[PDB]
Design an enzyme around this catalytic site. Structure first.
Site, PDB file in Angstrom:
ATOM      1  N   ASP A 101       0.869  -1.375   0.025  1.00 50.93           N
ATOM      2  CA  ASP A 101       0.117  -0.056   0.100  1.00 50.93           C
ATOM      3  C   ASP A 101       0.731   1.246  -0.015  1.00 50.93           C
ATOM      4  OD1 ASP A 101      -2.338   1.382  -0.001  1.00 50.93           O
ATOM      5  OD2 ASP A 101      -2.987   0.990   1.874  1.00 50.93           O
TER       6      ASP A 101
ATOM      7  N   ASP B  47      -7.505  -8.204   0.380  1.00 46.74           N
ATOM      8  CA  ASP B  47      -6.649  -7.957   1.732  1.00 46.74           C
ATOM      9  C   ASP B  47      -7.523  -7.584   2.679  1.00 46.74           C
ATOM     10  OD1 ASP B  47      -5.614  -5.341   3.096  1.00 46.74           O
ATOM     11  OD2 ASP B  47      -6.615  -4.915   0.983  1.00 46.74           O
TER      12      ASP B  47
ATOM     13  N   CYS C  50     -11.572 -28.610   6.669  1.00 45.65           N
ATOM     14  CA  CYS C  50     -10.610 -27.879   6.489  1.00 45.65           C
ATOM     15  C   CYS C  50      -9.221 -29.013   5.991  1.00 45.65           C
ATOM     16  CB  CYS C  50     -10.045 -26.920   7.382  1.00 45.65           C
ATOM     17  SG  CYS C  50      -8.895 -26.012   7.338  1.00 45.65           S
TER      18      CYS C  50
ATOM     19  N   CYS D  20      -6.131 -28.006   6.262  1.00 45.18           N
ATOM     20  CA  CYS D  20      -4.999 -27.303   6.813  1.00 45.18           C
ATOM     21  C   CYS D  20      -4.212 -28.087   7.747  1.00 45.18           C
ATOM     22  CB  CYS D  20      -5.043 -26.139   7.355  1.00 45.18           C
ATOM     23  SG  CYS D  20      -5.422 -25.788   8.781  1.00 45.18           S
TER      24      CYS D  20
ATOM     25  N   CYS E  25      -5.686 -28.519  11.232  1.00 45.68           N
ATOM     26  CA  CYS E  25      -6.841 -29.318  11.452  1.00 45.68           C
ATOM     27  C   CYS E  25      -6.722 -30.725  11.235  1.00 45.68           C
ATOM     28  CB  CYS E  25      -8.000 -29.010  10.576  1.00 45.68           C
ATOM     29  SG  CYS E  25      -8.592 -27.125  10.931  1.00 45.68           S
TER      30      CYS E  25
ATOM     31  N   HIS F  71      -4.507 -21.891  10.424  1.00 49.63           N
ATOM     32  CA  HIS F  71      -5.744 -22.263   9.871  1.00 49.63           C
ATOM     33  C   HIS F  71      -6.584 -21.325   9.320  1.00 49.63           C
ATOM     34  CE1 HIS F  71      -9.916 -23.890  10.073  1.00 49.63           C
ATOM     35  NE2 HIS F  71     -10.117 -22.853  10.333  1.00 49.63           N
TER      36      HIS F  71
HETATM   37 ZN   LIG Z   1      -7.874 -25.809   9.327  1.00 50.35          ZN
END
Ligand SMILES: [Zn+2]
Ligand SMILES: CNc1nc2c(CC[C@H]3O[C@@H](OC)[C@H](O)[C@@H]3OC)c3nc(N)[nH]c(=O)c3cc2[nH]1
Ligand SMILES: CNc1nc2c(CC[C@H]3O[C@@H](OC)[C@H](O)[C@@H]3OC)c3nc(N)[nH]c(=O)c3cc2[nH]1
Ligand SMILES: [Zn+2]
EC number: 2.4.2.29
Lengths: 366, 366
Positions: free
Chosen positions: B92, B263, B301, B303, B306, B332
């Protein structure tokens, strides 16, 4: 499959030894440094702890019986699955931290402030509920300095508690068959009391023996003097664990005196405060002299932090209070400690540990 | 090798588009979510940011000109090598944060408190020194609400600053040849001013166009109303970036209205505060109902958090103030946002984005 507990000595040099402890959840290379873990080694995932070379970590008992609670951790499947570390965990027995952080002491145990009790029986039970692999006897860490009378009375109580710890551990079949129990020698700085404590512990019989009551303000000269006579009193064929030690030079000198296992918050705590260990001595990364230094924390360190980031970047992170600063400092410091232990093990194995100790000190304190 | 900048639209559904921006340092899949970075995405190593699926991150200009300093980062090799992220970075221009966090405003720029100046020329120069890949024009984010007169005067100044930004960027050969420049539409909530701003920016010509001046207190209904008429005013063949947005439902609705880039600090900031995103809506992991919940943060999820840790463990960490709690929550949440963008991209590519938006909302707000 691995045994419940086997310690084997592969090589020796003077009083120093190198070898392995085999347990159900893994092998521990000795001499070993054990990173200290509220069910976390601060700022590191367990996979990162392992990647630094750690074979075993320490569960924070006193923190854990208060939060989240030992019964709760057991209901959730035990500390290993809770925090995601599947290798051995050693837990302290809790009395040191009660007397350090909380008290009413009696022959039964200690009550402390929410009010709670800790006794030999409850301490062993908590460590079972956590699923500890190496269980510490419930002891009393005598304050320093101590008069001979008070050191004797304290040590005598600890030895009575050591027997109660042994019996509580043995009366729980699942614990006795899957975990190990270490006794803790006390006796302050007094040779005759250290001898009486070692004799009492060996009569009871333990899987390993800790030197308790040190790293409590006595300084390195006195600690080394006490280790000189105290470690030979312990059974030679079992591991020797120096509780609360320590700085790199303290570890080297303790190994020279027969110690096999170490734990301390110094690499984690001081890492978050800006102290980074290097082979040329510690540095404080917050110092302005590092603001434009593109070198890694240490010029030889093999850790991922030194492969990827500069002193200048970590300086900026720590000055800005950024979490990533704590993460990178802690990973490097724990990795440095493990590289120190690896150099110790290799040098003992090669019969050149005395030379390593001399070279290490000449450079570290140049 | 990749071009300096190429945006290609691979599929469309209504006003929604999916495609790619190719730049020298990598490909950005759109619609894109860009995690926000003091030269760090808080609590994550860059490799972890990438593992969640991020193609580009945002450098914190206003933070960086103050600490560690733009000239210093340039002397150290630029932001990419400093922080260890080798893919595109968007920065920015700094005026929003000056007016939010620091002021004396003039046609020349803004002075603010250590005293500092920011002008179009200095903003573009700072972004060059940082080594930004996508450079934002220096603008004024009009406060909300704004009267038509004040919104007009502010927008007119921003358009004069947009031309100065363009000329400063173009007069620096290395920057013009290796980075891209985005203009920022202003005009508050007023259709005629948004049209005048879009026309001024298109006359100057930019590589991409941001919708500025939103997510500043107007609420989703009004934001969507302004997007309805504002996005079609921008060149169709260039990316559209909605600054400061936002929550998952805001992203979905903005994509339905033609936005390609997003963003926000919500996944990082609210993660450290205990808010975890799930397909069934956000949860606050600090709530006592999670103290013994062995399920992962979200049931679907993919990720690493998880895969490996329970709600109960993360609850304990956040309640204890542990750094690892912030690390796991942030990984996460950023991974959840990227999975949301992937589902958006795939559903547009398959002509089923309208159905995805409906299904997403029905479950997220059930
Ligand atoms: Zn997750
Ligand atoms: C710093 N000095 C020091 N720490 C010591 C600890 C805590 C280690 C525990 O503290 C940390 C780890 O949790 C470790 O376990 C001790 N614990 C027991 N049970 N008995 C002792 O005599 C003792 C002596 C120490 N000296
Ligand atoms: C939260 N709402 C919001 N943020 C906004 C930002 C900061 C984004 C910057 O803040 C963060 C990232 O650093 C990003 O870049 C804006 N920046 C500029 N230059 N102009 C705008 O009109 C504008 C509007 C916004 N609305
Ligand atoms: Zn290192």
């Amino acid at each position: 499959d691995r045994p419940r507990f086997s310690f084997s000595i592969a090589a020796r040099e003077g009083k120093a030894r190198t070898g392995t402890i085999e347990m159900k959840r893994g092998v521990i290379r000795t001499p070993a440094f054990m990173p200290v873990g509220a069910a976390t080694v601060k700022a590191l995932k367990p996979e990162t702890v392992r990647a630094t070379g750690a074979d075993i970590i320490l569960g924070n008992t006193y923190h854990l019986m208060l939060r989240p609670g030992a019964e709760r951790i057991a209901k959730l499947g035990g500390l290993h699955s809770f925090m995601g570390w599947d290798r051995p965990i050693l837990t302290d027995s809790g009395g040191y931290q009660v007397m350090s952080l909380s008290t009413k002491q009696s022959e039964e145990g200690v009550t402390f402030k929410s009010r709670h009790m800790l006794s030999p029986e409850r301490s062993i039970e908590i460590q079972h509920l956590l699923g500890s692999d190496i269980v510490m006897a419930f002891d009393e860490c005598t304050p320093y300095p101590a008069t001979p009378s008070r050191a004797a009375s304290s040590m005598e109580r600890s030895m009575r508690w050591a027997k109660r710890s042994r019996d509580a551990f043995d009366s729980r079949k699942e614990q006795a068959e899957n975990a190990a129990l270490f006794g803790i020698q006390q006796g302050s700085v007094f040779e005759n009391l250290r001898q009486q404590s070692a004799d009492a512990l060996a009569e009871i019989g333990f899987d390993g023996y800790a030197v308790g009551g040190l790293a409590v303000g006595e300084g390195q000269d006195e600690m080394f003097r006490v280790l000189d006579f105290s470690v030979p009193m312990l059974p030679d064929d079992k591991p020797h664990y120096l509780m609360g030690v320590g700085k790199p030079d303290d570890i080297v000198g303790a190994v020279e005196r027969g110690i096999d296992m170490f734990d301390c918050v110094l690499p984690t705590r001081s890492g978050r405060n800006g102290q980074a260990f290097t082979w040329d001595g510690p540095i404080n990364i917050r110092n302005a002299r590092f603001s434009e230094d593109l070198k890694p924390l240490d010029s030889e360190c093999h850790c991922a932090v030194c492969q990827k980031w500069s002193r200048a970047y970590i300086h900026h992170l720590i000055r800005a209070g950024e979490i990533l600063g704590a993460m990178l400092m802690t990973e490097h410091n724990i990795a440095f400690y493990q590289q120190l232990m690896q150099k110790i093990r290799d040098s003992i194995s090669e019969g050149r540990f005395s030379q390593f100790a001399q070279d290490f000190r000449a450079r570290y304190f140049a």
